[PDB]
Amino acid sequence: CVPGDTVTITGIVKVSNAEEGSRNKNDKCMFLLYIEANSISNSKYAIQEIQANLFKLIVNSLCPVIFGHELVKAGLALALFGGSQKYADDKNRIPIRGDPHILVVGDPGLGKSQMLQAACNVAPRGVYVCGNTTTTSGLTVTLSKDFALEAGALVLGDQGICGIDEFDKMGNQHQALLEAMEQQSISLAKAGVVCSLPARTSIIAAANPVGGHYNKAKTVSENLKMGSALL
Amino acid sequence: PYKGWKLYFSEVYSDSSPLIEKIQAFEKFFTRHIDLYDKDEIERKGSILVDFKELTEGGEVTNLIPDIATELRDAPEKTLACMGLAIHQVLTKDLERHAAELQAQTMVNVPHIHARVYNYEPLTQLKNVRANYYGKYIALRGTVVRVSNIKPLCTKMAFLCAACGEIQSFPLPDGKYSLPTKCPVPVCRGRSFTALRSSPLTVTMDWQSIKIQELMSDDQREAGRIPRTIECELVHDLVDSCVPGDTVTITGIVKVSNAEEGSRNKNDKCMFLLYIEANSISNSKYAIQEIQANLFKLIVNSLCPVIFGHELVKAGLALALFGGSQKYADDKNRIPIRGDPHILVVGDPGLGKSQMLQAACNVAPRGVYVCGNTTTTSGLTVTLSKDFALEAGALVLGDQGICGIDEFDKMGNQHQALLEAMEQQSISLAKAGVVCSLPARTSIIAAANPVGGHYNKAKTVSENLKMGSALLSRFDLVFILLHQLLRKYIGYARQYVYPRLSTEAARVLQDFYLELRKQSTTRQLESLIRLTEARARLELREEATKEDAEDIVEIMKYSMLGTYS
Amino acid sequence: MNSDQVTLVGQVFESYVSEYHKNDILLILKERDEDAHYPVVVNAMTLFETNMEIGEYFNMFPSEVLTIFDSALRRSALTILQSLSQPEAVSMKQNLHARISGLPVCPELVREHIPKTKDVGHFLSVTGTVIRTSLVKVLEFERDYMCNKCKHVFVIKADFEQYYTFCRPSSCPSLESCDSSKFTCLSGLSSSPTRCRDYQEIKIQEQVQRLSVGSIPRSMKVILEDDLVDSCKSGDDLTIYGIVMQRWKPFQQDVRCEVEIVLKANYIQVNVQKEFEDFWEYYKPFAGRNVILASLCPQVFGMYLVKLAVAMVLAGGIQRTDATGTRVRGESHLLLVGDPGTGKSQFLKYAAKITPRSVLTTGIGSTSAGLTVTAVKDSGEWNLEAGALVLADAGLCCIDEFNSLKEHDRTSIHEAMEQQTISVAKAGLVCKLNTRTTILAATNPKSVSVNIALGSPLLSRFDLILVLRIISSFILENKSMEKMKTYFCLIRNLSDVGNQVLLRYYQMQRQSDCRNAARTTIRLLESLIRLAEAHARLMFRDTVTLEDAITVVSVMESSMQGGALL
Ligand SMILES: [Zn+2]
Ligand SMILES: [Zn+2]
Questions:
Q1: How far does the centroid of ligand 2 lie from the alpha carbon of residue A151, in Å?
Q2: What is the SS3 assignment for B505-525?
Q3: C199 → closest Cβ in A31, A212, A213
Q4: For chain A, which residues lie within 8 Å of any Cβ of chain C, measuring from their own Cβ?
Q5: Who among B149, B206, B416 is closest to C365 (CB)?
Q6: β-strands A202-207, B434-439 pairing
Q7: Residue ranges of the alpha helices (H) in C444-545?
Q8: Which of B196, B268, C97, C418 is the most exposed place for a label (fewest CB within 10 A)?
Q9: A26: chain C residues, CB-CB within 8 Å
């Protein structure tokens, strides 16, 4: 199994004795448990009433506390369901991407963060991230050597939706998200370890304009605190 | 016959031991002076405060203790134990008599009573404390700098002897759980004891570690001498009796410290180490008359005898040294606002702005000087240290004094808490889940450099100075530039005279304020009162008149003349 | 306890559980898991009212009394199981713990501070806030041994005071006096029993919001065992009953000792009067508003509307719940767009010092790291730190220099003013945090729609927007807080005619439609509620009448005439 799979594990419950830590303050626990795995299995009516104004009903029910933004909620529902992962397993034809991405360019006080929250709440696998306390390991895969690769927000959101609020405040800790939106993968190159990790996720994001209220003569690529590499 | 003998002495009770004599001496002293103390408070707090002058009174109550001074100084741990056992015996006898009277119309359990002697003399300064003071009882007086947290401390542990059944209260050295080597009875030496931690003989009390710095003369004794510091251990009722910054008198025994701290480098680690076991702590919180009888200009020109000019800057410095009235209605909880004015020095380099801040911290009884390049947030704010303790910073060290900040235009976020201190007289702490508010009743005098160097141009103060309006509106005096006798006089005025504002001084301020309004911040008027009250404290007058107000107005006129250009 | 004390305790408790406390034991027996620890919550006051000696023996020896209580609980569970027509429908539970709750309210048993060394060995309750939680854990607590001469299997316990460490005995506790000192351990040889008790260490701290707690609150470690784990999280308000004990480690060759006062928990609970009644009778209203407004901030000239608006801010509010289950706020929001030095800062600071459970800041002096959340980290461990908008939960948050903040500090304030919550998503800390608070802001400016440095969504976020000889003598004569604090405390615990007054005023502002008109969401409606409350609150009423709604129109219209239009 790889990080992110849903597995069923049958086994015995035994006492763990290492013991980890430390510290602080304080996740150290002398007292400790673990499971000795004996077997592991890795997989990888109300609905019919809903199918029979379905689009607008699901759209308006995504965030019941956000007024307006009918088109924003319309794209959110489309990103939740997603397109076709058209991977020809018998031909090794890459599926390109079936997970669409959403950008929310808006002034403060519009509820852009709330839309990202509802994006991660209604999704079965949602990951919400703020754009101030940002780390490269917070989104990319994390290398830990004594080596192990720990799934980040771009990997934790696999087969789901990841929300990025205030990404205009993120530096190089955000540029690997561009590689994830296009390759559905994360590049790792640290301490002599080179690998490529899966990241089949849908990225919904929101940012603030350059000079505040931008109801002026400028366009989106000029008013938004973002370059064309991500637009 | 002596209930509580094992609460003070680890020895076996014997009527032939020399302890009985001193014990009965102090018992007579306490029975003759039983009405002078509050028995209820002694029983509740578990201690008793005895004046050293009562022991050395000389007569009949102190007939059996003629050498109390020498025996207390050379053998404190024995004399204090005898005194505590004696007061415990007096209290238990009185309470047994009361219980017998109640029963007629008898197990009285009096807890350990700490015999605490205060007002001890002669007073010993910290610089003369060497190693030979170990085991001696001395008194010191100094300012508290660090106050640690309250922690449990097991002083004694009960041990039951499996041979004869005797229970002893073996004291621990530094809290180290050690086992007794022999039974205290001179009969059996079983050398095998069982610990009884729930027994009342197992003494466990609150413990606190404070740090005391000697009262150093900022100019006389500062000829290459550093202020010496020492650690004191408060226990039981002495815990939480002083905050960092108070001047306390602590009497106690000198004992060897064994932790040992560090490390490193390079290198304040010391295996060899001292400390003081505190027995009692007391917390407070002619040439002058010739000076009072050209007083303003004399003190003003004598502040910095090496700075030419800056007559108005030295005028505001004297006003800040004396300070206004800390008008705190303790019976109404009416906040005093602020009685400590603040000074801003806007000037070019080469004017001597740093020297004015130095003289500000030198002539003041509690001065703290700080440079504006090597700056830390903990250097001015309170410092949190967890294993938690709060360490006083420059804004807290300057409490009841003056803090000088040079080149504050070079300070970043390590300086913004000074704005909260100038207005609230307090420091905000919020780190590692610890939220508190610490006192900071200080006077801030500061100096900075202009934006584009020499600024004799068409711009004003808020434009030429490397500073925003968030701090310019907080200063009582802004000056635009382009020893021991006055120290005693300032200290005496801050303690003796508390000024007031009269009606004549207000009428002068009313006319100037109304004429200033017809030309068309509120803290400007607050400065007029705070400096006028400071002038009354300078003249040693309880009430400021119109002459003091006009002088303060003219000083404010010079401040407003350099501004608004 | 001697035999008489134990006998009386057991008999009293057995009678009490044979008479009452039947359905709890029935539900415990009806559970499926037989190896689970099941609690039995019992009111200590009503139990001590049935017998006199039980309370004395509980306050004298709490641990043994709790053990006897557990034994009698097992006996009563077996008795109730045997009384059923189909005993096979349920299952007997042997891990029963009597959890004491509801101690007699007294300062010697109900504590608001951390217990000291005097309280060691006593059973008492401590009320605090959880600042730290550890993971849930598993490990051994008893160890079985066997004798080399009689083959008798006995058990030794782990010393809780020594962090659950075992010491090898040297005496055979068999029924026959064995002189054998050679014993063998059977703990690690096999796993015949599953003798292991749950364990968790939480950290509580004194609540500085309380009146008895001073400036620096103290912390304490609480040990939860068995079913007491997973019963709380970081930030909860707990009232932990239990025994104050001492855990220690001694000196060694290179190791220093360490003694610690901890609380072994037994139950967890998640959380002048005649004068005030006379002041309320005189208020029952315009003269009372003048007294409260003058007593709120006497250090200021005029500004009757600001003193009144602040009164409603400290007054409101009360939460509601609509048909969609959405929480509808109560706490107010007042904006003071006054020139610098007019005294608006003197208001908020004295109002924050006069009010219990209150916070404040000065805008840019505290960014979003000091307003909402901060993921405090250390190694692979982290926790949640509360900001100004969080520490004011069920309290007041004041922010001077409100427009001096960055657009992201305002965005965080936008969420706290619009949801009573603040989203957490820093480092590996993702959560939803409740910040039910009122916000009293004041802005330093540069009509009243251009001088303000706030966006139009943020100006609409405030319920009221106010713009700011006899002065010298007023200070000269100046040259209470406690009662007003106790007022708004009692007062903070307290129609169609109202809704008409506020809909008519809003319709008059909506009809004359130029280019300026926003859409109401809740800040109007629930200002109208907390204002309507406040006018009745401050005067101690349970119904909003015409006078309350009329005074609201006077303040709200004056706020839209001279202040920023909503
Ligand atoms: Zn013996
Ligand atoms: Zn045996």
A1: 57
A2: HHHHHHHHHHHHHCCCCCHHH
A3: A31
A4: 15, 21-33, 64-65, 67, 107-111, 113-114, 117, 127-130, 132-133, 135, 138, 165-166, 169, 208, 212-213
A5: B416
A6: unpaired
A7: 456-459, 472-478, 481-491, 496-511, 523-537
A8: B268
A9: 132, 134, 201, 381
Residues 6+ apart with CB under 8 A from C132: A25, A26, B433, C202, C203, C234, C383
Pick the closest to residue B435 from C564, C344, C529, C214 (CA basis): C214
Which residues are in the CB-under-5-Å shell of ion ligand 1?
A: B 161, 163-164, 183, 188, 190
Q: How far apart are CA A222 and CA C515, in angstroms?
A: 27
Tokens of A112: 């852009």
What are the φ and ψ backbone dihedral angles of B57, each rounded to 5 degrees?
-70, -40
- Among A22, A128, A208, beta carbon nearest to C407: A208
Closest CA to A175 of A229, A102, A130, A221: A229
Nearest to C387 by CA among C378, C377, C397, C400: C397
Binding residues of A, as ranges, are 106-113
Question: How many residues comprise chain C?
Answer: 566
Residues of C in contact with B149 (CB under 8 A): 218
Under a CB-based contact definition with an 8 Å cutoff, are residues A152 and A139 in contact? yes
Sign of CA dihedral B205, B208, B209, B213: negative
Q: After which residues does chain A become discontinuous at a C–N distance over 2.5 Å?
A: 44, 52, 146
CA of B180 to the centre of ligand 1 (A): 11
- b/e C124-160 (16+ beta carbons within 10 angstroms → b): bbbbbbbbbbbbebbbbbebbbebeeeebeeebebeb
- Residue contact C259–B153, C-beta within 8 A: yes
C325 three-class SS: coil
CB contact under 8 Å between C208 and B435, yes or no, is yes
Calpha distance C134→C43 (Å, rounded)? 29
Q: Are strands B426-431 and C123-133 parallel, antiparallel or unpaired?
A: unpaired
Question: Does the annotation flag B184 for ligand binding?
Answer: no
Distance between CA A120 and CA B541 in Å, rounded? 71
Question: Closest residue of C to A151, CA-based?
Answer: C428
Residue C345 assigned as binding residue: yes
Question: What distance separates the 2 farthest-apart alpha carbons in chain B?
Answer: 100
User: Mutating which of C132, C141, C200, C408 best tests the A interface, going by the most A Cβ atoms within 10 A?
Assistant: C408
Residues C236 and C113: their CA atoms lie apart, in Å, by 17
What technique determined this structure? X-ray
Nearest of B424, B414, B281 to residue B340 by alpha carbon:
B424
Conformation bin of residue C290: beta by default, left when phi > 0, alpha when psi is -120 to 50:
alpha
- Backbone torsions φ then ψ of A153, nearest 5 degrees: -60, -35
Residue C89 DSSP code = G
Q: From C299, which residue of chain B is nearest by alpha-carbon distance? A: B334
Residue B174 labeled ligand binder: no
Helix H or strand E segment including C292: helix C286-296
Centroid of ligand 2 to alpha carbon of C176 (angstroms): 7
Determine how β-strand B156-161 pairs with β-strand B193-196: antiparallel
Q: Do C20 and C43 form a contact (C-beta atoms < 8 A)?
A: no
Dist. CA C487–CA C275, nearest whole Å? 11
Alpha-carbon distance of B295 to B293, in angstroms, equals 8
According to DSSP, the residues that pair with C126 across neighbouring strands are: C111, C240
CB contact set of B241 (below 8 Å; sequence gap of 6+): B234, B248, B281, B283
Q: Which of C401, C372, C388, C402 is nearest to C462 (CA)?
A: C402
SS3 of C414-468: the string is: HHHHHHCEEEEEECCEEEEEECCCEEEEEECCCCCCCCCCCCHHHHCCCCEEEEC
3-state SS class at B24: helix
Beta-carbon separation of B154 and C362 below 8 A = no
Instruction: Give the CB-side neighbour count of residue C412, counting CA atoms within 13 A.
Output: 28
